[PDB]
Amino acid sequence: KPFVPKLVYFEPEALSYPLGKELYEKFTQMGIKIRETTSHNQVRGIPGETELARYRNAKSTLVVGVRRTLKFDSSKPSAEYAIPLATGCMGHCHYCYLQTTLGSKPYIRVYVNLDDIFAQAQKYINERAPEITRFEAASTSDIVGIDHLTHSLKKAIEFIGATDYGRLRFVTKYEHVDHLLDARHNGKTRFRFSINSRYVINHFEPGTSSFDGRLAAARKVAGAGYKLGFVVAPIYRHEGWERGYFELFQELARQLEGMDLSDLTFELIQHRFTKPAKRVIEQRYPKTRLDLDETKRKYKWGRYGIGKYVYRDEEAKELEDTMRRYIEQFFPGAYVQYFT
Ligand SMILES: C[Se@@+](CC[C@H](N)C(=O)O)C[C@H]1O[C@@H](n2cnc3c(N)ncnc32)[C@H](O)[C@@H]1O
Ligand code: SF4
């Protein structure tokens, strides 16, 4: 509010880059505890005697490192590629799918070699030009929520804005967007916000900005000329979900009335969870009301990893049809990019 870490790790090589140097100067000036780590993927000594303590303390830890990977992962259906600027999040969403992603770490990571990263991005753009290449910057982090510390996203926005065939997009649950409002985005960045029913936000999204805060930020970014979008996710069949999601879209329309919404986009993602999710989530959030009963679900098998549970076809279809009705009612001429 906005996020500031209570412990910072640096890779020694990180100090060779402007961002690493800048962050070391900032955090030493603030008197924050700073440690050294050989790799940002191998961070040792995070305080805590229990698993819950170590998890919660990791969520208050920042790790400053060099990105050595290299190839960008695909990010379909959002975008062609995930541009890697950060990994991890300070938020505590009970359902967060990043918790059980292969190789995910609970701490927040930021990468300092932006020249390298943007160079590789340009390479991907050139490989496909004159076709457009889209980059997702919040695939494995809340890149916006972290950004006031680094301005790495602001730099990426302006990098992409300068390109002819590159486009950028990202989604956030945080309202701390003021430093991004004067960025030279050149119309090539889609600024999105995660929204949900009152039930889901109140019960499952602690440590994030409120709905009203997210909408205040949305009006700001739209007013600064960014393309605006919303991601309705996770779509979760809680008791009274039909009316809950009806009221979401009704309230969303009221909070955006007056504004031009001719190019507004919606993305719909149903709640999914993996086989190890129940054990992990119940350890980290003992009092959660999140239902992870796999017997009511359909399993989608993994390809190179493990798969996940989604709602059954009938219930998934019901969710999709209902969401599409609401968007048609309150946002005629808004585009629904996908339901998954
Ligand atoms: C990985 Se989230 C990273 C970006 C940012 N920190 C944010 O929260 O918007 C990206 C989206 O995915 C959703 N999401 C998270 N977990 C799940 C899930 N388990 N099932 C279904 N959806 C899940 C979140 O609500 C987001 O809309
Ligand atoms: S804000 Fe996004 S990345 Fe952070 S815990 Fe919530 S879903 Fe996960």
Side-chain angles (χ1 to χ4, degrees):
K1 181 53 176 195
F3 174 68
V4 172
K6 303 179 190 302
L7 181 62
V8 182
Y9 287 80
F10 286 82
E11 293 181 350
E13 292 73 16
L15 268 51
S16 301
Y17 300 84
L19 182 57
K21 174 173 187 293
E22 179 183 328
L23 289 178
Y24 187 70
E25 290 163 356
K26 178 184 171 61
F27 294 128
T28 57
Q29 196 253 248
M30 293 173 79
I32 296 175
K33 190 164 283 175
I34 294 162
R35 285 171 185 170
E36 189 182 337
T37 183
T38 303
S39 169
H40 66 242
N41 206 46
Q42 289 262 295
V43 171
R44 283 158 190 176
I46 292 178
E49 310 298 345
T50 59
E51 288 290 343
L52 185 57
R54 289 195 287 277
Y55 171 66
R56 284 195 185 175
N57 291 336
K59 285 283 193 172
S60 287
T61 301
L62 182 68
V63 178
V64 183
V66 177
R67 184 79 184 185
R68 284 168 200 279
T69 303
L70 180 127
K71 126 185 140 51
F72 288 12
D73 295 325
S74 60
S75 204
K76 297 294 191 182
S78 166
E80 278 72 42
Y81 301 103
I83 185 169
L85 305 179
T87 312
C89 181
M90 52 279 153
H92 278 282
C93 302
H94 290 198
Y95 55 70
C96 188
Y97 90 83
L98 297 175
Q99 298 184 83
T100 59
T101 294
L102 260 179
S104 73
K105 302 288 183 180
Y107 50 81
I108 300 83
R109 277 180 278 183
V110 294
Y111 305 116
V112 299
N113 56 326
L114 298 182
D115 191 306
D116 288 351
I117 294 169
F118 299 163
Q120 183 57 38
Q122 189 61 66
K123 263 198 53 153
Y124 283 122
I125 292 169
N126 293 348
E127 276 174 21
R128 293 169 44 81
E131 268 192 289
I132 303 305
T133 300
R134 299 164 300 161
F135 296 90
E136 169 63 61
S139 183
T140 62
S141 67
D142 204 295
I143 199 66
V144 171
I146 300 165
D147 204 51
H148 71 281
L149 299 168
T150 69
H151 291 211
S152 294
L153 193 66
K154 196 176 186 179
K155 289 168 187 173
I157 286 167
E158 296 184 323
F159 155 64
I160 291 291
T163 71
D164 289 333
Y165 304 108
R167 299 288 186 280
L168 189 62
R169 65 205 320 271
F170 44 83
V171 52
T172 187
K173 288 192 178 80
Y174 293 84
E175 76 191 328
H176 311 109
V177 302
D178 291 330
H179 73 279
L180 299 164
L181 300 179
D182 72 354
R184 294 176 287 268
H185 54 82
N186 197 205
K188 304 202 175 73
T189 294
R190 178 78 67 176
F191 210 128
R192 297 128 70 218
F193 293 89
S194 284
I195 58 177
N196 223 309
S197 68
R198 195 159 168 282
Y199 184 102
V200 168
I201 297 181
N202 289 352
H203 293 114
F204 305 137
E205 305 186 357
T208 65
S209 296
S210 68
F211 178 84
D212 284 344
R214 293 178 209 175
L215 265 288
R219 289 190 290 276
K220 286 174 183 180
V221 304
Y226 283 94
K227 293 184 295 184
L228 182 59
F230 294 101
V231 179
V232 189
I235 300 171
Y236 181 80
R237 292 171 68 90
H238 57 87
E239 193 181 16
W241 68 263
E242 189 181 22
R243 196 193 182 116
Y245 286 101
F246 171 85
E247 290 172 338
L248 165 59
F249 288 109
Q250 185 179 232
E251 177 64 2
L252 197 73
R254 190 187 71 80
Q255 293 215 30
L256 297 169
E257 68 192 315
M259 302 163 56
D260 174 31
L261 305 173
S262 59
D263 192 25
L264 188 62
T265 56
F266 287 92
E267 297 163 69
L268 310 173
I269 310 179
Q270 69 181 304
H271 179 238
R272 68 211 51 239
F273 66 92
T274 63
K275 288 197 284 205
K278 174 142 58 190
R279 289 193 310 282
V280 175
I281 288 175
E282 287 182 356
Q283 186 185 64
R284 297 170 168 186
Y285 310 98
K287 296 158 56 176
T288 185
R289 323 222 296 188
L290 191 70
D291 190 291
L292 300 166
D293 181 11
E294 77 278 344
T295 68
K296 276 99 165 192
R297 298 276 191 145
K298 176 191 184 192
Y299 195 66
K300 304 298 286 174
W301 296 95
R303 194 165 92 152
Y304 286 100
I306 65 170
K308 70 277 186 185
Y309 291 100
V310 296
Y311 291 115
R312 294 161 187 283
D313 289 1
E314 320 90 62
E315 287 146 57
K317 192 181 196 312
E318 195 176 71
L319 291 174
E320 175 169 10
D321 288 348
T322 306
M323 295 309 102
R324 284 186 185 275
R325 283 200 205 82
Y326 294 154
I327 292 171
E328 179 73 335
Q329 184 185 331
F330 294 106
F331 301 92
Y335 185 61
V336 177
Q337 298 190 321
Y338 56 86
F339 177 94
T340 185

